[PDB]
Amino acid sequence: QQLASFLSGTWQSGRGRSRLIHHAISGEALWEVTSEGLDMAAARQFAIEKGAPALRAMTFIERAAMLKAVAKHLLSEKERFYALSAQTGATRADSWVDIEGGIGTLFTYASLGSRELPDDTLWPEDELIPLSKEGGFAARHLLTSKSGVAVHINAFNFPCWGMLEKLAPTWLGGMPAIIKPATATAQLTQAMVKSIVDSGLVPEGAISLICGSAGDLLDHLDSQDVVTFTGSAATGQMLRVQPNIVAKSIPFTMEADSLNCCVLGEDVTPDQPEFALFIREVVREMTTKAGQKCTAIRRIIVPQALVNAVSDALVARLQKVVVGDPAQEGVKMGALVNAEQRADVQEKVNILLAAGCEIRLGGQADLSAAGAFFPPTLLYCPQPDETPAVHATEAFGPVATLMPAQNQRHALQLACAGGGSLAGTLVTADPQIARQFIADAARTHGRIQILNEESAKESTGHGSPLPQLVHGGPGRAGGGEELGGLRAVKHYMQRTAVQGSPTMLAAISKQWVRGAKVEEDRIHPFRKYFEELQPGDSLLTPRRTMTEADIVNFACLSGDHFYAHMDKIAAAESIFGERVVHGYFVLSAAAGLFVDAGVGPVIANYGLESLRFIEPVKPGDTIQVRLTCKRKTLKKQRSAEEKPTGVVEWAVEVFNQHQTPVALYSILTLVARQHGDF
Amino acid sequence: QQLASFLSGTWQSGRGRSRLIHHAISGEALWEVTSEGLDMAAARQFAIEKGAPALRAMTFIERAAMLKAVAKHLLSEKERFYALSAQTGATRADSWVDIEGGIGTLFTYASLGSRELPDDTLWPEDELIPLSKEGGFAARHLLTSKSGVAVHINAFNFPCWGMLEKLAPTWLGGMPAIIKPATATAQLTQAMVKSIVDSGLVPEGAISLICGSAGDLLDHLDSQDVVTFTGSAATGQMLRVQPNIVAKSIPFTMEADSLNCCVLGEDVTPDQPEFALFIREVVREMTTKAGQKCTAIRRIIVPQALVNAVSDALVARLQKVVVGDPAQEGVKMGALVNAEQRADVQEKVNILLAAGCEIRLGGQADLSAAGAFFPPTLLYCPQPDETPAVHATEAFGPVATLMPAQNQRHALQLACAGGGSLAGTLVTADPQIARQFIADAARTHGRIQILNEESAKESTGHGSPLPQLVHGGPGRAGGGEELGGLRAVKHYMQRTAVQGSPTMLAAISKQWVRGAKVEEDRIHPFRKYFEELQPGDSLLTPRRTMTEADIVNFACLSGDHFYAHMDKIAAAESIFGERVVHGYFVLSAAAGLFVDAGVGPVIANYGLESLRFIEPVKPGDTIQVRLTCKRKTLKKQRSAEEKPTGVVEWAVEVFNQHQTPVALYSILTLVARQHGDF
Amino acid sequence: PGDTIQVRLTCKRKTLKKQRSAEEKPTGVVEWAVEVFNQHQTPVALYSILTLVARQHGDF
Ligand SMILES: CCCCCCCC(=O)SCCNC(=O)CCNC(=O)[C@H](O)C(C)(C)COP(=O)(O)OP(=O)(O)OC[C@H]1O[C@@H](n2cnc3c(N)ncnc32)[C@H](O)[C@@H]1OP(=O)(O)O
Ligand SMILES: CCCCCCCC(=O)SCCNC(=O)CCNC(=O)[C@H](O)C(C)(C)COP(=O)(O)OP(=O)(O)OC[C@H]1O[C@@H](n2cnc3c(N)ncnc32)[C@H](O)[C@@H]1OP(=O)(O)O
Numbered sequence A, B: 001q002q003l004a005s006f007l008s009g010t011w012q013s014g015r016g017r018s019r020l021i022h023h024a025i026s027g028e029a030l031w032e033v034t035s036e037g038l039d040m041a042a043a044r045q046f047a048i049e050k051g052a053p054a055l056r057a058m059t060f061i062e063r064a065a066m067l068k069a070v071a072k073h074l075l076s077e078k079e080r081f082y083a084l085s086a087q088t089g090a091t092r093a094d095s096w097v098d099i100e101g102g103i104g105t106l107f108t109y110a111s112l113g114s115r116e117l118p119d120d121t122l123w124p125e126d127e128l129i130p131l132s133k134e135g136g137f138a139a140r141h142l143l144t145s146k147s148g149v150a151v152h153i154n155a156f157n158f159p160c161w162g163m164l165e166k167l168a169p170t171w172l173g174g175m176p177a178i179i180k181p182a183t184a185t186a187q188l189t190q191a192m193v194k195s196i197v198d199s200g201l202v203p204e205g206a207i208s209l210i211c212g213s214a215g216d217l218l219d220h221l222d223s224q225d226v227v228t229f230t231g232s233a234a235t236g237q238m239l240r241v242q243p244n245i246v247a248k249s250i251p252f253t254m255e256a257d258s259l260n261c262c263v264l265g266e267d268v269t270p271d272q273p274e275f276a277l278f279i280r281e282v283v284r285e286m287t288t289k290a291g292q293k294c295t296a297i298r299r300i301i302v303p304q305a306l307v308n309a310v311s312d313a314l315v316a317r318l319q320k321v322v323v324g325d326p327a328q329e330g331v332k333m334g335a336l337v338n339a340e341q342r343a344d345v346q347e348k349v350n351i352l353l354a355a356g357c358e359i360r361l362g363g364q365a366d367l368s369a370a371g372a373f374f375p376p377t378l379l380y381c382p383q384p385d386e387t388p389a390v391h392a393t394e395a396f397g398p399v400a401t402l403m404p405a406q407n408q409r410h411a412l413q414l415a416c417a418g419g420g421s422l423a424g425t426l427v428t429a430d431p432q433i434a435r436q437f438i439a440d441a442a443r444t445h446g447r448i449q450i451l452n453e454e455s456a457k458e459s460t461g462h463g464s465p466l467p468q469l470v471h472g473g474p475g476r477a478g479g480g481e482e483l484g485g486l487r488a489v490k491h492y493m494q495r496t497a498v499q500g501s502p503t504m505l506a507a508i509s510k511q512w513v514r515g516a517k518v519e520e521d522r523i524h525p526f527r528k529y530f531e532e533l534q535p536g537d538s539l540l541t542p543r544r545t546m547t548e549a550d551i552v553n554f555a556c557l558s559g560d561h562f563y564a565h566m567d568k569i570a571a572a573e574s575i576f577g578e579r580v581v582h583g584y585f586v587l588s589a590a591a592g593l594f595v596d597a598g599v600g601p602v603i604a605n606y607g608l609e610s611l612r613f614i615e616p617v618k619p620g621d622t623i624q625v626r627l628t629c630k631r632k633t634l635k636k637q638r639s640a641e642e643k644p645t646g647v648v649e650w651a652v653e654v655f656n657q658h659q660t661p662v663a664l665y666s667i668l669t670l671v672a673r674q675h676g677d678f
Numbered sequence C: 001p002g003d004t005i006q007v008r009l010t011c012k013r014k015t016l017k018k019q020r021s022a023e024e025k026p027t028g029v030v031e032w033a034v035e036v037f038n039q040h041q042t043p044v045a046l047y048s049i050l051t052l053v054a055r056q057h058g059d060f
C-alpha cells in the first residue's frame, strides 16, 4: 500500500527501492514508504515562491489565528488519529499524551502569538537603544521572518507532538515547512498533514511532507533556510557536516538522545511521601510510551543507604505493570514500534550488561514474538564512576539503570556525568538541597523538575515537554533548544539591528518610539476609534502647577504619609533636599490632564507597562503631559457577544517648566474597534 | 624575537617552524610567532580547574565591577596601545576607533551587568510561567553559566577590539577565555593580555593567550565549551566540520566575511544634503582602517539615472585621500598590514576585473614596496544581475564596487543578492522607502543604518559595531550573533527551565515568585536595611473599604473624570455594569496601606515595574495589600559622597474581600544599605 | 503653618475592668499620656487619652 508524500502542492509518491512500516502489535506491513524520483528542488521552489510570501503577507495576529483554526480543526477530527496511533503499539493514555500534546502546543502558540505579537509583518523586540547624546540617532532590534523553508527531520516517537511542536513556531515565525517524518510511523504524520491541507486554513505551499528519504533536499538549501533535526546523535552528527549546510551556513538545530537522571536527595527517608512519589514518578516515567520518549528517566541516582529500599520498591511497583496489547483490558504498558527497535533495545541492554548488573528481566526478551514487546527492565551499577558505558549508552525502551551516591556531592557529579542531558529530577523537601542541585546540575540539563509533595499534585511529570518551556539540552542532547515560548519562533526569524533617526525607526517598526515626529490633529486621541488611531497621535496637555496643597491632599487621600512628603525636617535630611510631590500624584494628575471625560472608544485601563521617576517634582512646579499613541495590536473577540476591541499602548511623557522629563512611562488601554469579525 | 603565549599562568613560547610578523608601514620583521610544543590540554585543564570556579563563585555584579576595573586599568595606559597599534599601519583615528571601541565595550558591559544582572550566581530571565490551576506547580527559566572555556579565534583587523568585545560577554558570563589572535597582528593582543594579567584584577586562569596556531586545542574541548570564530568563510567552514566540535556538539559561533550593500534611494537628488552625506559615508567607510574592517561598504547600489553623478562625486572626493605613513602629516588613509594581504586584495581585484569594469586606480598596486600600500579603488559593474562574481568575492581593502538599480525593486534584490550580509545601509528621506527596504532586506543583513540628514549629525557610522546591537548576519556573514546587549552573555550560559513549586523556585532563584512561602516577622519590611531584607519578607496590610466618596475625592483631586467613575448612566452601559474605583486610586491606596511613615532605609520610589488590573474595584468592596520582597540587586556607590544603597523590588498583591487579586504588580524602591564597599 | 508635629504616645495607667457579663469580651481601660511637641521640642498640647483595650485572659 502506497504512503503518499505531499510535494509541490500535489499528493505524490515515490518510485524505486523502499522501506516499509511494520505493524507494532502484530507485525505485518500495512504501509510502505518511498520517495525516490520525487523532485526535491521543485518542492523547495514551490514552497519558497508560493507559500513563503503567503505567510509573510500575513500579520502575526493572522498567523496565530490560523494556528488556532488548525488546532480546532485537528481537535475536532482527533478520533481517526487515535486509530492511526494505535498502530504504533501505544496505549490509549500514551496516544492521548501524543495527540493532545501536539494539539495543545498549537493552542498554546496561538494564545502566545495572539497576546504578545504585533499586528504587523515585522516584530520589534526591543524598546529603544539611544545611541546619541541629543536623540537624533538611535536603534532597535527587528525580527523579520526568513524567506526560505524549514526542513524538519523528526523521530519516530511523537508523530503528532514532535511534528506539530516544530510546526507552530515555524508557521508563527512566517516560514513554510517541509516535514521529513521517521519512516517507522509516518502514517500518523500523513494523517496530520492531510487533515491540515484538506481544511483551507493554511495557504498552499505552507506545508509539505516526504515519507521516505530526502537525500537531495539538503543539497539544495539556500542560506535563508533552517534545518531542525530530531533523532539519535549519530545521524545528526552526519547531517551537521553536510557540505551545503556548512557552506551556505544555514542554522542546523540538532536535538538528540539523552541520559536523563533522577536524583534522590539525602533528606528523603522511606517513611515519607517524598519516597513514594519518587518511586511513582520513576515507574510512571519509565513505563509511559514503553520508554520510547526522549524525556524518560534512564539513570536513577539514590543515596547509598537507600539502594536496597529503592531497588525493592521499584520492582514491587513494576511487577504490577502489564505488558501486552492495548485493546485488551487490564494492560498498562504497550509495545514498541519495530522488531528492529526491539533488537536495538536488547543490544543496548547487552552493551550495558558488559559492565553492569541485573535486578529484573533484562536481556531475556523474546525476539521470536509477533509483537514488539520488551519487558520493563531495571538495571544496577555497583561501580558508577568507574563505568563510562552507563553514562554514554541509552537503551531506548523501558530500561533505566540504578546506581548509588555519596551525600549530595557524588550525586551531582553522577547527574552531570551524562555529558549533557535533556531532563532531570531532584526529589527532595529541603529547599537548600535544590539550590545546590540547580547551581551545579543545570549546566548540563535543559530542564529540571524539583519534585516534592506540593509539586506532585498538579505536576505534568518528568516526560512532558511543555510548549512554553525550553526543550533542549547541551552536549549529548544536541545543544539546540526548542519550545521556549516565543524563543522558539525566533529561530525562524532574522534578528537585525536597525539604526537611524527615531522618526525613521517609528515608520520602520510601525510604532512610535521616543523621538519621532508626532501627528497632532486638533482633536483628542481618546475620541478616535481603533482603526483611525495611528502610532504617533500625540497630545500636548494643558499644565497643572504642583503645590504644597496638592502634596497635602494626596497624602491625606491616599494615606501615603512618607517622610519626604509630610515632614519638613527629614525632607531636608533626605536625598531630595526638601519636600517633593508624590510619584503616584504625578501619575494621577497626568491622567487628570489627558483623559477625556466623555463616553468614547476608550473602555478600560488594563494596566501600566513600565514606570520610572527620573527627577523629583517639587511644590511650585508645573506639569505637562505628552500622551502619544505607540502600539495598536488588536484582540480577537473571543465571543460573538463581546464588543470588538484592541489594546492600544500610549507613551506618556510628563515633564515640567524646564522641559525636563520627570516620570515618563507607558500605559496600556483597551480601546473599542469600529469593526469586528463576530 | 619571541612573542610569548600565555598558558597555565606562565608566559611560555613555542618551539617549531615560526611565522613572523612584518611591520606594516616599513616592511621589516620585528616579531615572530610560534606555539609548537605548548601543552594545550594543560592550558584547558588549568583554566577549567582554576579560573572557571573563581569566576563562577562571583556574582554578576562583582563580574561587572571587575569589567569596569579592567576597563579603567586599560584606559590609564592606552598610549602603549597606540604605540603598538601604529605598527599595524593604522592611523591615529583608526587606532583610536580600535582601542577606544574595545574599551568602551568593556564600559558598556560593565554598565549593563551592573544595571540589569542580579546579585546572584544564577540568573532567572523570565518572570514566572504558571503551569497549574491551583498554583503549586510552576516553572521559570534559569541561566546558569558554563563550567568550561571559551575559545576565541579572532581576525587580524581589530586586535584590541575584536578580542575585547568577546572577552567581556565571556567574563560577564563567568567563563575563562583562551584567545587565539591572528598571527599577523598578535603583538597588540599580547599587549592587551599582559596589561590585563599584570594588574591583579582578574582571577588567575581567567584568561589565556596563544600567539600562534592552536593545533591541539579544538581536539580537547568538552561539551561545556564554546568556540567563537572571526575570520574568512573559507576557514570557519573547515573549523565547523572539526570532528570534536561536531562530536561533543559544542556551540561554534561562526562569523565571517560579508559584502555590505549601501543603497542610494530614488528620492535622493544631487542637490540635497542626502547625496553629499551618502558620498561622505561611502568615502569615510571605505577609507577607515584602509578598508580593512568587516563592516566596510563593498557594494554601492545607486539608481540608474544617478550613476555618473555618484561616480564623479566619488572620484572627486577619493582623489583627495592621501595614502602614506600615519606619523607624517597630511595623510588620511594608512596602509594594510602585510604584503601577503596586499597580494590577496590585488588577486581579488583581478577576479572582480575578470567579469567587471574599472573607474579609478585599481589593480595597479606596487608589490615591491617597503610597505603594504594599496590605492583606494572604485569599481563598476554595468550588469549587476548578470555577474555572480560581484556578489561572491570580497576584496578586503579599499576596494568597493558600484552598480546601478531600477526604481527600488532592483535595489532590494541587489541588496539581498549578497548571500547573507552584515551592515547594510539605505540613504533616503522618505520613510516608506525605508519601510519597504527593511521589509525585504533585513532578511540578509544583521544591521541596517537608515542614514538621513537627522541621523548623520551624531551617527556612529556604517562600520561601528555598537556593543549593544547584534553584530552578525546570516548566510555568508556566518550566522552567528555577537554584542546583542545581554544577548551576547547568553551564548556563554545554559538556559534551563527549572520546574517545581513556587516555594522551591524562590529558594532556587534567590527571589520570591508568586506563591512561595512568606516570612512575616512582626516588624515592617520598610524598617529593615538592605542587608536584612530577604526575598520573601512579606507584609499583610490592614484593609480599606472603597466607597463612593473615595471615587469622588480621587476623581476630583486627580482630575480624571472618566465616565466609568463619575457617571451613573454611562457606567451602567459600559463593560463594568456600574461605577468602579479608579485603578490609580487602587494603586495609591495600596501605597497608603504598606508605606512606613517614619524615617528609615527606604529612600525613593524609583519607578514601578509592571502593573496589570484584573478585576474592577467597586464601592462597598474592601482592599487588602500583600507587600513582599522580591529582588535586592545592590547598586555600587559611584562616588565617595553618595550613600550606600540598593534597589529592592517589591511584589505587590492587592486583593478584595473574596481574595481575588485585583491589581497585582511590582514596585521598585531604592533602599539604603547599612554597609558599603569603600 | 510650617511647624512639624511629633507625638509621644506612652502608656500611663492600666486598671482592668471586670467583664460584667459572661458574653462580654475581657477588657481593660488603658490610659495613655500623649505628649505632642514641635521642632523646637517644646510641648504644644499635651493631653491624656483613655482607651478600652482587650485582655488576653478574663474571669468569665
Ligand atoms: C510608594 C513606594 C514606597 C516608597 C515611598 C515613597 C517614596 C517617594 O515617594 S519619593 C518621591 C517620588 N520619587 C521620585 O521622585 C524619585 C526620583 N527618581 C530619581 O531618579 C531619583 O533622583 C533617585 C533618588 C532614584 C536617583 O536615581 P539615580 O540613582 O540617579 O538613577 P537615574 O540616573 O536617575 O536613573 C533612574 C532610572 O530611570 C531610567 N530612565 C528612563 N529614561 C530616562 C531618561 N530619559 N533619563 C534618565 N533616566 C531614565 C533609567 O534607565 C534608570 O532605570 P534603570 O533601573 O533601568 O537603570
Ligand atoms: C488612564 C487610562 C485612561 C483612562 C481609563 C480609565 C478606565 C478605568 O479606570 S477602569 C478602572 C480601573 N481599571 C480596571 O479595572 C481595568 C479593568 N479590569 C480588567 O482587568 C477587565 O476585566 C478587562 C476587561 C480589561 C479584562 O480583559 P480580559 O478579556 O478578561 O483579559 P484577561 O486576560 O482576563 O485579563 C487582562 C490581563 O490580566 C493579566 N493577569 C495577570 N495575572 C492574572 C491573574 N491571576 N488572573 C487573570 N488575569 C491576570 C492577564 O495576563 C492579562 O494581561 P496580558 O494581556 O498582558 O496577558
Ligand SMILES: NC(=O)c1ccc[n+]([C@@H]2O[C@H](COP(=O)([O-])OP(=O)(O)OC[C@H]3O[C@@H](n4cnc5c(N)ncnc54)[C@H](OP(=O)(O)O)[C@@H]3O)[C@@H](O)[C@H]2O)c1
Pocket: A153, A154, A155, A156, A157, A158, A162, A180, A181, A182, A183, A184, A212, A213, A214, A215, A230, A231, A232, A233, A234, A235, A236, A238, A239, A255, A256, A257, A258, A293, A294, A396, A422, A471, A477, A478
Ligand atoms: N527533542 C529530542 O531531544 C528528542 C525527541 C524525540 C526523540 N529523540 C531521540 O530520537 C531517537 C529515536 O529516533 P530515531 O531512532 O529515528 O533516530 P535516528 O534513527 O537517528 O533517525 C532520526 C531521523 O533521521 C532520519 N535519517 C536517518 N538517517 C538519515 C540520513 N543518512 N540522512 C538523512 N536523514 C536520516 C530518519 O529517517 P528514516 O525514517 O528514513 O530513518 C529519522 O527521521 C531517540 O534516541 C530519542 O532519544 C530526541
Ligand SMILES: NC(=O)c1ccc[n+]([C@@H]2O[C@H](COP(=O)([O-])OP(=O)(O)OC[C@H]3O[C@@H](n4cnc5c(N)ncnc54)[C@H](OP(=O)(O)O)[C@@H]3O)[C@@H](O)[C@H]2O)c1
Pocket: B153, B154, B155, B156, B157, B162, B180, B181, B182, B183, B184, B212, B213, B214, B230, B231, B232, B233, B235, B238, B239, B255, B256, B257, B258, B293, B294, B396, B422, B472, B477, B478
Ligand atoms: N564579525 C565579523 O564578521 C568579522 C569581523 C572581523 C573580520 N572578519 C573577516 O575576517 C577576514 C579577515 O581576517 P583573517 O584574514 O585573519 O581570517 P583568517 O585568516 O581566515 O582566519 C582568522 C583566524 O583563524 C585562524 N586560522 C586560520 N586557519 C586556520 C586553521 N586551519 N585552523 C585553525 N585556525 C585557523 C587564523 O590564525 P593564523 O593567523 O595562524 O592564520 C586567525 O587567527 C575578513 O574577510 C573579514 O571580513 C569578520
